[PDB]
Design a protein around this ligand. Structure first.
Ligand code: HEM
Ligand SMILES: CCCCCCCN1CCC[C@H]1C(=O)N[C@@H](Cc1ccccc1)C(=O)O
Length: 454
C-alpha cells in the first residue's frame, strides 16, 4: 500500500491551475512523464487519479470493478448531447436502449451499406485536390474535417453539409464548434460565476437552441415525408429495443444525431490528419502504404471488399492512434471499494482518468522505440497485449463508431495514397490543438497528382 504522487499545487486552487492552458492533455502527459504510472489530481471539491501504465489500466478496464464516469468535460458536453450514447450513464434507461437499437447499424456488416455515401464524399476530396493549381497547398485538418463532417451528415441523416462548397462552416457547425469550445473552456475556470462569463453563458444557450432547431427540423421533415433511406435516422425511427420493446423518442434521436456530428467533426478528422503527418515525416512508410493502395484500389471507385484488403493502411492508422489517440482520455468510477494494483486503495465512487497517449507510450509494452512511427508494430494483431491499445475506449462503453471511423479513414487514406504524391514543403513542426479532441494545427502539404482518373 503506497501514497500516490501529486503535481504542484496553488494553495486553495490545489492542482486546478495546471489545466489553465490551451493544451491541458499535453500538460498532463508531461506530468505523467515526471510522476509515473499514477498521480492524484485535486481541484476545489474534486479528486481524480490519472493512470498511464498498462499494469493499472488493465485493472481499470475490468467492467466488474469500474464503470464509465462522465468527466467534467462530458458533463459540460451533456448540456447539448443530452442522454445520447456518449454522455449517458450506463445505468440510464436510454443508454442500454439506444445501444441495443444502434449496435447493428454500426457493425462491420452495416459498413457495406454506408460505403457508397463514404465514396461520394471521398471522391469530392480527391477532386478538390486534383483541381489545385501548381503554387497551392492543402490545409490538412481543415480538409479532413470537411470530409468527416460531410460523411457523417450523409450516413447519419442523408443531409449534405456541402463543406467542399464553403469557406465558412454551415451555421449548425458554427454553433456546435462554439458549444464544444465553451464546454472545454468552462473546465479551467477557478471562478465560473464571474459576470465576465455572462456573455459566454448567453451565447452557449443560443448555440444549443440552433443545434436543437436544425436537428428537430430534420427529424420532423423525415417523419412527414415517410422516406426510407440507408441512414442512421431511418434505423432510429424504425428500430425497437429487444429488451424494453420501445423505440427511441424524438428528443433522444436528436441527442444521438448531435452526438454523431460531434464525433465525425472531431475524431476521424484528427486521425486522418495525424496519419498524413506521420506518412510525410516517414517516407519509407508512405511508400509501403502507397504501394498497397496502388495494387489494391484497381478500380476508379473503391469497393467495400477492396477497402478491407488495405492491411498496411490500417496499420498506419493504428500506429497514428497509438501515438496521438485523437480522443485522448476516458473516465471510470469504482463500483465498490477495491485495491488498484495491490497498492492504491479506492472507495466506491472514486474516479480514475485513463491518459490514453501515456498508455500508448508504456515502454514495458512497446519497447524503447515508443516515440518512433512504425506501423509494423501492428503487423500481428495477436502480439498486442489486452488493454495495451485503447484509442476507442473500453468494454460495453467502447466507441460504437469504431468500424465506421476505420472504414472511412482506410477508404480515404487509400484513395489519397493512390491519387497523389505528398510533400512536407514547410518542414511542418507538429503543433497539437486541443478541442474535445487532438488535431494537428497549421499542418499543410503539397500534393502532386499521379494523374489516375476517377
Ligand atoms: C478515430 C475516430 C474515433 C475515435 C478515436 C473515437 C473514440 C472514442 C472513445 C475513446 C470513446 C469512449 C469514451 C468514454 O469512455 O468516455 C468513444 C465513444 C463513442 N464514440 Fe467514438 N471515436 C471515434 C469515432 C466515432 C464516430 C465516427 C462515431 C459515430 C458516428 C462515434 C461515436 C461514439 C459514441 C456514440 C460513443 C459512446 C458509446 C457508448 O458509450 O455507448 N465515434 N469514442
Ligand atoms: C472524446 C474525448 C473526450 C476527452 C475528455 C477529457 C478531456 N479533458 C480536458 C482537459 C484534460 C482532460 C481531463 O482530464 N479532464 C478532466 C479534467 C479535470 C480533472 C479534475 C478536476 C477538474 C477537471 C475532466 O474533464 O474531468
Amino acid at each position: 500500500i503506497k501514497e500516490m504522487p501529486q503535481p504542484k499545487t496553488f494553495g486553495e486552487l490545489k492542482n486546478l491551475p495546471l489545466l489553465n492552458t490551451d493544451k491541458p492533455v499535453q500538460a498532463l502527459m508531461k506530468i505523467a512523464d515526471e510522476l509515473g504510472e499514477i498521480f492524484k489530481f485535486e481541484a476545489p471539491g474534486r479528486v481524480t487519479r490519472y493512470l498511464s501504465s498498462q499494469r493499472l489500466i488493465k485493472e481499470a478496464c475490468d467492467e466488474s470493478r469500474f464503470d464509465k464516469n462522465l468527466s467534467q468535460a462530458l458533463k459540460f458536453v451533456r448540456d447539448f448531447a443530452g442522454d445520447g450514447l456518449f454522455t449517458s450513464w450506463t445505468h440510464e434507461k436510454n443508454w442500454k436502449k439506444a445501444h441495443n437499437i444502434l449496435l447493428p447499424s454500426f457493425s462491420q456488416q452495416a459498413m457495406k451499406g454506408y460505403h457508397a455515401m463514404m465514396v461520394d464524399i471521398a471522391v469530392q476530396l480527391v477532386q478538390k485536390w486534383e483541381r489545385l493549381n501548381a503554387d497551392e497547398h492543402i490545409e490538412v485538418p481543415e480538409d479532413m474535417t470537411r470530409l468527416t463532417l460531410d460523411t457523417i451528415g450523409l450516413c447519419g441523416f442523408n443531409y449534405r453539409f456541402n463543406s467542399f462548397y464553403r469557406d465558412q462552416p454551415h451555421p449548425f457547425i458554427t454553433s456546435m464548434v462554439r458549444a464544444l469550445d465553451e464546454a472545454m473552456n468552462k473546465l479551467q475556470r477557478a471562478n465560473p460565476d464571474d459576470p465576465a462569463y455572462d456573455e459566454n453563458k448567453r451565447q452557449f444557450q443560443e448555440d444549443i437552441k440552433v443545434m436543437n432547431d436544425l436537428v428537430d427540423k430534420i427529424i420532423a421533415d423525415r417523419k412527414a415525408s415517410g422516406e426510407q433511406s440507408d441512414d442512421l435516422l431511418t434505423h432510429m425511427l424504425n428500430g425497437k429495443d429487444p429488451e424494453t420493446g420501445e423505440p427511441l423518442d424524438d428528443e433522444n434521436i436528436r441527442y444521438q444525431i448531435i452526438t454523431f456530428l460531434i464525433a465525425g467533426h472531431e475524431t476521424t478528422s484528427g486521425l486522418l490528419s495525424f496519419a498524413l503527418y506521420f506518412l510525410v515525416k516517414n517516407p519509407h512508410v508512405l511508400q509501403k502504404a502507397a504501394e498497397e493502395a496502388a495494387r489494391v484500389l484497381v478500380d476508379p471507385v473503391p469497393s467495400y471488399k477492396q477497402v478491407k484488403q488495405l492491411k498496411y493502411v490500417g496499420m498506419v492508422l493504428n500506429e497514428a492512434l497509438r501515438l496521438w489517440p485523437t480522443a485522448p482520455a476516458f473516465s471510470l468510477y469504482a463500483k465498490e471499494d477495491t485495491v488498484l494494483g495491490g497498492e492504491y486503495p479506492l472507495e466506491k465512487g472514486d474516479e480514475l482518468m485513463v491518459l490514453i497517449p501515456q498508455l500508448h507510450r508504456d515502454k514495458t509494452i512497446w519497447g524503447d522505440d515508443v516515440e518512433e512511427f512504425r506501423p509494423e508494430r501492428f503487423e500481428n494483431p495477436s502480439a498486442i497485449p489486452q488493454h495495451a491499445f485503447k484509442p476507442f475506449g473500453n468494454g460495453q462503453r467502447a466507441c460504437i463508431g469504431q468500424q465506421f471511423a476505420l472504414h472511412e479513414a482506410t477508404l480515404v487514406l487509400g484513395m489519397m495514397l493512390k491519387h497523389f504524391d505528398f510533400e512536407d514543403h514547410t518542414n511542418y513542426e507538429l503543433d497539437i490543438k486541443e478541442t474535445l479532441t487532438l488535431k494537428p494545427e497549421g499542418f499543410v502539404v503539397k500534393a502532386k497528382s499521379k494523374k489516375i482518373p476517377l
